[PDB]
Design a protein around this ligand. Structure first.
Ligand SMILES: Nc1nc2c(ncn2[C@@H]2O[C@H](COP(=O)(O)OP(=O)(O)O)[C@@H](O)[C@H]2O)c(=O)[nH]1
Length: 162
């Protein structure tokens, strides 16, 4: 079985744990200890291929960035600061990876909220500038969660095939 090492990064509070748990347990967890950092695994079928996702839920290290094959760069659509922090996360990943093109997906979480401060178009354009996909999600309603992680796996698959 093919294993995919995924790393979820982003400012505190954007919903990294909630996203990971929703994927794994299919339910919305709030108030999850913000200081806990661990990896979660799930065997799934993506595009006819059975694989094992190994997801590191970061809490805030080039060590794990080095081992990671793909990265979910998450920000919250109602927190502009988390969006601008994306640049820094991507720079760190590229730095330790010594590569210009590392599998990455820009995730705009909390799309269920009405008070949006980051427009989808802004993120879309930034992602396009980075050459990566942009996917809006909601760990609360689960909208786009599977899309986010599965898209990253496909990015990794394509990266490996090159
Ligand atoms: N409305 C809404 N709140 C969310 C969503 N995802 C996470 N949260 C809330 O945001 C807070 C932080 O989430 P958490 O997963 O702990 O953030 P992290 O620090 O990135 O791991 C919690 O209070 C969650 O309940 C979401 O999609 N929608």
């Amino acid at each position: 079985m093919t294993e995919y090492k995924l790393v979820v990064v982003g400012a505190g509070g954007v919903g990294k744990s909630a996203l990971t748990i929703q994927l794994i347990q299919n339910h919305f967890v709030d108030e999850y200890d913000p200081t806990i950092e661990d990896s979660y695994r799930k065997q799934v079928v993506i595009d006819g291929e059975t694989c094992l996702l190994d997801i590191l839920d970061t809490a805030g290290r080039d060590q794990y960035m080095r081992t990671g094959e793909g990265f979910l760069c998450v920000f919250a659509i109602n927190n502009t600061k988390s969006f601008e922090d994306i640049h820094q996360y991507r720079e760190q990943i590229k730095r330790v990876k010594d590569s210009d093109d590392v599998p990455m997906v820009l995730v705009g979480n909390k799309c269920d909220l009405a008070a949006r401060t980051v427009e989808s178009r802004q993120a879309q354009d930034l992602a396009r500038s980075y050459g990566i996909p942009y996917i809006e999600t909601s760990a609360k309603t689960r909208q786009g969660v599977e899309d986010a992680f599965y898209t990253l796996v496909r990015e990794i698959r394509q990266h490996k095939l090159r």
